[PDB]
């Protein structure tokens, strides 16, 4: 209801005098990423009150941010991946985030899906050594050889079920043998999917293999010493 023909509703009866100036009252906090990444610095975020030091801290503990792995990791191909970073400590105009999840992007999924070949999907729920509970989803499409003449390359479901069980074994042994930084550093340069390919080449040669998605489900009791250790307390300055 902007214009002069547009009738009144219950609508514009009791309004509010906008006077508060929210973008006067607000305040800017810088965030920062863990040490497993190259370009640690990213992002400034707002807090809906300044006048709560502890209230502001409550907002910034609540947050979840997410960012493109390219600019997080130097390589300026927007490498079709997302890192969700969760903020769980505050210290002095610096938020000390932590890893929260991961996803591909829907345009990359369309970029791999093809017609005359089947996809294989495994989705294993695991536990790290730090008692996080993960759900990892891994995708792989079958391929035709460097030799074929048949026009399509479908996998017989024995081969599919043996591949799905193999992917399950490699994922769960690797992530149970990780800790969460050790995982993250494994996940960054794509070494899991070479392990998958090299262990599944004896079945039915797959081409296009990925760790699609990672979902966090459980966290332990929070660990200040661990987190500040993962990033890597201070004198004031004597107002008189």
């Amino acid at each position: 209801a902007v214009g002069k023909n547009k009738r009144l509703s219950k609508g514009k009866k009791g309004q509010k005098k906008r006077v508060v100036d929210p973008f006067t009252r607000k305040e800017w906090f810088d965030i920062k990423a863990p040490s497993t990444f190259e370009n640690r610095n990213v992002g400034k975020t707002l807090v809906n009150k300044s006048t709560g030091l502890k209230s502001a801290s409550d907002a910034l503990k609540g947050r979840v941010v997410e960012v493109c792995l390219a600019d997080l990791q130097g390589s300026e191909d927007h490498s079709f991946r997302k890192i969700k970073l969760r903020v769980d400590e505050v210290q002095g105009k610096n938020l000390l985030t932590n890893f929260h999840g991961m996803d591909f992007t829907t345009d990359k999924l369309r970029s791999m899906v093809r017609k005359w070949q089947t996809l294989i999907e495994a989705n294993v729920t695991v536990k790290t050594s730090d008692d996080y509970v993960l759900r990892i989803f891994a995708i792989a499409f079958t391929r035709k050889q460097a030799n074929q003449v048949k026009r399509h390359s479908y996998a017989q479901s024995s081969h599919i079920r043996a591949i799905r069980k193999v992917i399950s074994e490699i994922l769960t042994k690797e992530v149970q043998g990780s800790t969460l930084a050790q995982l993250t550093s494994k996940l960054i340069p794509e070494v899991i999917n070479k392990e998958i390919e090299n262990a599944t080449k004896d079945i039915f040669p797959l081409q296009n293999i990925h760790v699609r998605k990672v979902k966090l489900l459980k966290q332990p009791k929070f660990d200040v010493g661990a987190l500040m250790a993962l990033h890597g307390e201070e004198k004031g300055k004597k107002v008189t």
């Binding site: 902007v2 214009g3 002069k4 992002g43 975020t45 707002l46 941010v65």
Partner: peptide
């Protein structure tokens, strides 16, 4: 929206920016 995705900075609707409907 700010980068975290919670605090909206300003949002504007085409419906409220046209006099017509």
């Amino acid at each position: 929206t700010d980068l975290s995705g919670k605090e909206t900075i300003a949002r504007v609707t085409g419906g409220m920016k046209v006099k017509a409907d």
